[PDB]
Design a protein around this ligand. Sequence first.
Ligand code: ARG
Ligand code: CL
Lengths: 394, 393
Amino acid sequence: GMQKLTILGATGSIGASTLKVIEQNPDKFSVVALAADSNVEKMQQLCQRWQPEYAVMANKEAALRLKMALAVLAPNTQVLGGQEALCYVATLEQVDSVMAAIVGAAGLVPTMAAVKAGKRILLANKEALVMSGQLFIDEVEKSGAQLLPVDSEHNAIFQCLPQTVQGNLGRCDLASQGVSHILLTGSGGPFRYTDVAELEAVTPEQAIASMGPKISVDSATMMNKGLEYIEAKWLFNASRDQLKVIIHPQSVIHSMVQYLDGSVLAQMGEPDMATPIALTLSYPERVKAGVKPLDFTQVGELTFLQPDFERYPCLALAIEACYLGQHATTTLNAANEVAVAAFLARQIKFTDIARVNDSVLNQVCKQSLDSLESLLELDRMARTLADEVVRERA
Amino acid sequence: GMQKLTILGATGSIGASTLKVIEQNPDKFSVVALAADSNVEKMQQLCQRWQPEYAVMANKEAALRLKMALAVLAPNTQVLGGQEALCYVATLEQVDSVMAAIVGAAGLVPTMAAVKAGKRILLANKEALVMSGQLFIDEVEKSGAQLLPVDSEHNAIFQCLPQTVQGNLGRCDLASQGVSHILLTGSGGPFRYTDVAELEAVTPEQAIAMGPKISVDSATMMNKGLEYIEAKWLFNASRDQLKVIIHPQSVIHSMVQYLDGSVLAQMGEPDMATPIALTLSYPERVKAGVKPLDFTQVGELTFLQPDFERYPCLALAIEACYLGQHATTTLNAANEVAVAAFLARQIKFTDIARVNDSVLNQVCKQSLDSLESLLELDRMARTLADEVVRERA
Ligand SMILES: NC(=[NH2+])NCCC[C@H](N)C(=O)O
Ligand SMILES: [Cl-]
């Protein structure tokens, strides 16, 4: 009856939220392995509290430091280091679910290893579907793995869909289950009400407005929503007709689904990742998450805007890239990482982010079976091109 | 494949919405019988268009006029009259579903007959659960009938609940399916922002701002009180599991709060074809002739907390709910009389609650129910309400 978990990415906020849910439900969930790619100090404190069978650092030098610490703080925890070790804890025979919350391309291989092992995948890595969506959906079908999305918007959509679609992510025909379209919602970022002409003079200070700066700039360009759009396409097998973006500045509603009869289902809640995580752990049942019920006294007004592509050119690029396929979305994601770093380094203007993305995307896709290796190679090629366009713009 | 329907109450707006959905889906639904009260002109036009096997008027004189009209225009339609005939078309062997949209206490007996026949019941009669909830839920269990609520709020709640609950209405333990509570929403009516002191002087013109009884009930929030009582019986909700929220714009139709912090809400254009369509198609979905919700034109959504100084009727309904069938039957009956008196300008708007309150107290100080015995109680309560209306006048 007990569900056994490996947590990939235990020292971040997703890891923390996952552990809070497990803390509320000690009779249902048990932590077999914890793994991290940063923060040995946090990791040793978590291994002390959780005493897991395995603890893994992605970096081998960091694993050595952890092993020395846990010789005192968690003597029965076996510490391991490296990429092979991440795959090892992700594929253990006794493990039922894997929280895949290591970010970036470093998360692909261990997430993929869990997929090939037929595990239940609590998906909190954007790159798996942005870079290699077709590949991931195929491997999931091949092994019988269950995919359950962690991210707020995707999780909300998941909850607003019928059970037949929930059980068969990536392979169901939406129109045959009565779905007209999915409404992906977003706040619109700090420049939601800013005149388009003023965007040229925007500074990194303004674009940050609390989480990491790359994620904040993506929120300002709505590239964050673009990437979510791409993931939604693969998660829910949605065509461009079936997938819409709506700006909802207050973020109380997390996303919605429009049905054929006129009915709309929406998911709402307090802004706490423990809620969506809790469902990924408990599906199809539900568990206490340590999150209070929504307080309609404090919600204030809910409003909606149509995104303007003059304001959010990156969003148009992501939608376009989406339906061109893996090569285009890998290219766009790579280019954007370079373009954002250049804006933050004050080499290019805020509005140049979209121009860099647009140039690189056009160059790559005018040319004519994919693997994780070949797509990483393409990621690298796109970065090189983006570096060159950054110089043109500087 | 084809679902066969009897429509009780075909000439009203619910009947019209049902027929619009059937019109969109001729490969899935077929009309076996249509039934109505005494709008013979609308009924003959519908029997012309639909050519059903049976057509029934509740009034026998009206049935005779219809029978003469249809003898050429709908030659294959057998016309019948009276209460027994309503029960007959509601219980036909070939019929799968019954739209129970005859309103008031007259709807109880034929709706109940459909229930005892084990039919799928598309419930659009408030009285079945307000007056005789215990009795209906028991009879539904006994026969294996499916109950699917037509009314907007209940239908919304139904859609926001898990599938395991949807398949067992009136008998599922909500907490065991992860539900903390149901959030029954309402507009708050035309006086949502009005000072309590000003309610004494409101006139029927102001209370109407859609039949007039339903509008006044919307102004007092008795509408929400009645819906509260029905929800309790439909979803088997305890006093912890059922809440009321004011949402003035009525875009959100109701919501459900789950154990993990997640809330599901149902929204849509204000068109009864949507909820009706789901009652017909469940667990699948069908085209309903309703456009998708346009979020560019929705405007702002807000929420308020009801005040019992502003909505005394809502407190009465909740109170009556947990006192049982006798109390809810009494309150409903009293309120029908009290609203008619307000509309006739015999009593003040704020006297509606006072009449309801007096009658409810009088009846429940005194001490196996049937439809007959509860109808008698309905009549006794009306008599008392008439007397309190004179005191107030
Ligand atoms: N977190 C990191 N940047 N790790 C890089 C180190 C790679 C690791 N030592 C290995 O050989 O598998
Ligand atoms: Cl967002």
